[PDB]
Ligand binder design. Sequence first.
Ligand SMILES: *[C@@H]1O[C@H](CO)[C@@H](O)[C@H](O[C@@H]2O[C@H](CO)[C@@H](O)[C@H](O)[C@H]2NC(C)=O)[C@H]1NC(C)=O
Ligand SMILES: *[C@@H]1O[C@H](CO)[C@@H](O[C@@H]2O[C@H](CO)[C@@H](O)[C@H](O)[C@H]2NC(C)=O)[C@H](O)[C@H]1NC(C)=O
Ligand SMILES: *[C@@H]1O[C@H](CO)[C@@H](O[C@@H]2O[C@H](CO)[C@@H](O)[C@H](O)[C@H]2NC(C)=O)[C@H](O)[C@H]1NC(C)=O
Ligand SMILES: *[C@@H]1O[C@H](CO)[C@@H](O[C@@H]2O[C@H](CO)[C@@H](O)[C@H](O)[C@H]2NC(C)=O)[C@H](O)[C@H]1NC(C)=O
Ligand SMILES: *[C@@H]1O[C@H](CO)[C@@H](O[C@@H]2O[C@H](CO)[C@@H](O)[C@H](O)[C@H]2NC(C)=O)[C@H](O)[C@H]1NC(C)=O
Ligand SMILES: *[C@@H]1O[C@H](CO)[C@@H](O[C@@H]2O[C@H](CO)[C@@H](O)[C@H](O)[C@H]2NC(C)=O)[C@H](O)[C@H]1NC(C)=O
Ligand SMILES: *[C@@H]1O[C@H](CO)[C@@H](O)[C@H](O)[C@H]1NC(C)=O
Ligand SMILES: *[C@@H]1O[C@H](CO)[C@@H](O)[C@H](O)[C@H]1NC(C)=O
Ligand SMILES: *[C@@H]1O[C@H](CO)[C@@H](O)[C@H](O)[C@H]1NC(C)=O
Ligand SMILES: *[C@@H]1O[C@H](CO)[C@@H](O)[C@H](O)[C@H]1NC(C)=O
Ligand SMILES: *[C@@H]1O[C@H](CO)[C@@H](O)[C@H](O)[C@H]1NC(C)=O
Lengths: 49, 415, 50, 100, 40, 77
Amino acid sequence: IAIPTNFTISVTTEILPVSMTKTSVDCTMYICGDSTECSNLLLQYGSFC
Amino acid sequence: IAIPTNFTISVTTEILPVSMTKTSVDCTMYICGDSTECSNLLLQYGSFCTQLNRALTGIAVEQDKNTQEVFAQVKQIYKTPPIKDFGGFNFSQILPDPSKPSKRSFIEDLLFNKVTLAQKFNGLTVLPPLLTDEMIAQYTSALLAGTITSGWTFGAGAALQIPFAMQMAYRFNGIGVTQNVLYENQKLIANQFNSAIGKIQDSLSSTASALGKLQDVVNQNAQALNTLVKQLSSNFGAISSVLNDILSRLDPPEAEVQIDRLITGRLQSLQTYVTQQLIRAAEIRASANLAATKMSECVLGQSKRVDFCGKGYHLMSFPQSAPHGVVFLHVTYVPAQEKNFTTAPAICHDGKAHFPREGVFVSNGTHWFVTQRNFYEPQIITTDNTFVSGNCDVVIGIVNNTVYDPLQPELDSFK
Amino acid sequence: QQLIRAAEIRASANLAATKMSECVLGQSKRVDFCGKGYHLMSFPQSAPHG
Amino acid sequence: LPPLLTDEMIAQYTSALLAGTITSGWTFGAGAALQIPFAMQMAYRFNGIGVTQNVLYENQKLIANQFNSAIGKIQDSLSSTASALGKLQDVVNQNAQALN
Amino acid sequence: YEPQIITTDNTFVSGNCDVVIGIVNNTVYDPLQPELDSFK
Amino acid sequence: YQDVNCTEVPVAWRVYSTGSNVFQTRAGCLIGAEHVNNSYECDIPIGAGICASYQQSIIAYTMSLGAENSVAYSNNS
Ligand SMILES: *[C@@H]1O[C@H](CO)[C@@H](O)[C@H](O[C@@H]2O[C@H](CO)[C@@H](O)[C@H](O)[C@H]2NC(C)=O)[C@H]1NC(C)=O
Ligand SMILES: *[C@@H]1O[C@H](CO)[C@@H](O[C@@H]2O[C@H](CO)[C@@H](O)[C@H](O)[C@H]2NC(C)=O)[C@H](O)[C@H]1NC(C)=O
Ligand SMILES: *[C@@H]1O[C@H](CO)[C@@H](O[C@@H]2O[C@H](CO)[C@@H](O)[C@H](O)[C@H]2NC(C)=O)[C@H](O)[C@H]1NC(C)=O
Ligand SMILES: *[C@@H]1O[C@H](CO)[C@@H](O[C@@H]2O[C@H](CO)[C@@H](O)[C@H](O)[C@H]2NC(C)=O)[C@H](O)[C@H]1NC(C)=O
Ligand SMILES: *[C@@H]1O[C@H](CO)[C@@H](O[C@@H]2O[C@H](CO)[C@@H](O)[C@H](O)[C@H]2NC(C)=O)[C@H](O)[C@H]1NC(C)=O
Ligand SMILES: *[C@@H]1O[C@H](CO)[C@@H](O[C@@H]2O[C@H](CO)[C@@H](O)[C@H](O)[C@H]2NC(C)=O)[C@H](O)[C@H]1NC(C)=O
Ligand SMILES: *[C@@H]1O[C@H](CO)[C@@H](O)[C@H](O)[C@H]1NC(C)=O
Ligand SMILES: *[C@@H]1O[C@H](CO)[C@@H](O)[C@H](O)[C@H]1NC(C)=O
Ligand SMILES: *[C@@H]1O[C@H](CO)[C@@H](O)[C@H](O)[C@H]1NC(C)=O
Ligand SMILES: *[C@@H]1O[C@H](CO)[C@@H](O)[C@H](O)[C@H]1NC(C)=O
Ligand SMILES: *[C@@H]1O[C@H](CO)[C@@H](O)[C@H](O)[C@H]1NC(C)=O
């Protein structure tokens, strides 16, 4: 048998992500942009946005 | 130091979703809907509909797999004896009630009545679950009967009988409290358990927003299906959203374009629906895995992991069934009414240092005793509850006292 | 893509909560769950997103 | 959008957890916090791994010195290393890249 | 299953015989008495 | 045939639609299997607690959860 006669105290680091940035996008400003004709055309595509 | 002098028994509830409604959508019936021209044009796009059907079928099978994993964990169907002598503990509100229809209990009836809220459409079908609600109730009844009658023995091999008070003494011993505390306080512990169980039904009777997760899942699925159905009244740039009007009011060669314009949009809608369904199914599968782990580790045994099953020191747990999920009632031990003492790490006597075997040294101001670490029960410092190692000039915090030798009086009086 | 990534972030957060509960508020007997060796204790610190 | 909990609040939570574990042990995770001298709590924790109390009490100075030295080394490792955070940065990159 | 004789070495005493519900009367053997009788 | 009355099956191979062995379950209409009063472990899941197996010919039964067992509980045993 083998038996230890001394010891050591060790400190170890662990890193874990918990969240990410909250980002927001809207269609009408991204797809068309302050344009009535484009938004009227986009209204024919239902409720994707 | 501070040491508690009393305790409370607390039961708490945890809600977990395990399953989700099994739905099926026919690709060609949804896209075309009784039109040979549309079907012949849709034949040109390859095998998108086969992939969509395969994905939905896999999602449907996964739900039955989840339910079987969570609930079908007992080999036999155990029953409770007709005579109920459990040391004063009253399980009447969680055991099956057979006067009323079905084999449900009082709390299960409350849960099923609380969670309350489609129709036949063009290509939409809903498949029934493999296990009815009665079979799930019967699994839960078997688990309760086993855990009440045999302890944790039925989870490893065959069930072995044990009186309930002795089982609960085992469970106190498993959290660091000796068997004295239970047998001398049996009536109080039973009363506290009964009162907490009675409070559970009051808490979940008047209040309704407790079952938030199950209703959230139901609402999300209903909203997704409603949006998919409503997307059928968009022309996507064509002249109309109805194929009959397009076919009647236009001849084929320039009706091809309008039909293609409708087909592309309807395909896109179906694909986005299927993708979000896959993601939601993955989330539900993770939840069901957690629920199965909790059933295995907290109903079929006693858990040492902190906060895994309730707040406090875990004593035991009971399962109940819900419309599309499971409910866990965790019974835990909470110390209370702490008192304040002064301590020492070791005691020097005859030039030797003594340490406690299983407790701590305390004093009420003048005299020193040894106590448990979780309940105040002082005792005289003898040589039977301490062990000696070394001299008393190396430990920081030594105090002087005397260690009783029980053999000295008997071998002095009788020599 | 954002939804698929958020699922993984949520899994990491659940693991972090379990470690906070079982290693800072108690002593753990699970092998290699908190460090390499025999666990004695743990201390938390905050990071910009973790 | 800004997160609901700011950095000072998270630091307060971390400080509360650290003070509770240093002063009470594991008692504050079940009910009210019960005070305990630190050396006796470390003796409890040695009993928890199969080593007796006298081993702690007769080598207290050495154990304290080893702990202090390890804590000192960890900050040198953090400061000198070029990139030890790793995963935390990686997530950020991904998001930014997708946005671009 | 491995039965033993009930002695003061495998049991511990605490309290009276009134508080506990299912008490059973029996005897607890004392290992010291035989040698104390044989060696005064 | 999923969620359909057994009546209007043949109106909308022709031997697997006749009224020889016709059973009305809750998952739909089943043709070609005999309905027995026994219960066994599930073999092929049909649904709503109904399973099917091959035992001679094909049979359809209600799933059995397991074997009954009453533990000899007593307060001093
Ligand atoms: C056990 O032995 C004691 C003394 O050796 C004896 O008193 C007990 O007999 C009865 O115990 C009852 C305790 O439940 C007590 O209420 C009753 O008065 C007592 N009878 C007499 C005549 O004293 C013994 N117990 C049993 C069960 O025989
Ligand atoms: C157990 O290990 C410790 C750490 O190495 C030893 O303590 C060292 O002893 C040497 C020689 O006496 C000193 O030069 C070091 O400064 C000590 N280290 C510390 C941190 O104090 C200890 O002697 C060992 N115990 C044995 C071998 O029985
Ligand atoms: C421990 O707490 C319990 C309360 O749960 C105490 O029991 C109560 O005692 C008061 C005063 O004697 C009674 O009015 C209550 O009816 C008791 N409650 C129950 C449920 O019986 C108990 O006395 C406490 N123990 C100590 C040593 O103080
Ligand atoms: C366990 O508790 C139930 C109540 O939750 C007790 O049932 C009540 O018993 C009293 C007296 O017999 C009746 O007046 C009530 O109408 C019962 N309530 C219900 C809902 O049935 C039951 O008696 C308790 N168990 C024991 C052994 O006393
Ligand atoms: C600490 O506890 C001891 C033991 O319970 C107390 O000593 C007893 O005190 C009472 C009342 O004065 C006497 O009747 C007993 O004879 C004492 N027992 C002894 C001396 O063995 C002591 O008073 C307590 N000290 C406090 C509460 O400050
Ligand atoms: C605890 O007991 C030791 C041993 O008796 C005490 O140490 C002695 O104290 C007396 C005075 O009371 C001195 O005359 C002796 O020289 C001391 N040493 C020895 C070996 O006897 C000690 O004072 C007591 N109290 C404390 C707090 O340690
Ligand atoms: C002893 O502990 C109690 C808490 O139960 C505390 O209120 C009291 O101040 C303490 N005694 C001191 C600090 O002298
Ligand atoms: C505890 O601290 C006090 C200072 O208030 C000091 O006098 C005493 O020696 C210390 N005791 C131990 C055992 O560290
Ligand atoms: C067991 O129950 C019977 C019947 O109620 C009773 O006479 C007996 O005293 C009980 N035994 C114990 C140990 O509680
Ligand atoms: C169709 O099946 C249902 C369900 O069993 C039944 O109630 C009904 O009588 C059957 N026939 C018709 C014409 O609906
Ligand atoms: C099964 O039993 C019921 C009575 O419970 C009876 O009406 C029915 O005909 C039986 N089925 C067969 C196939 O014998």
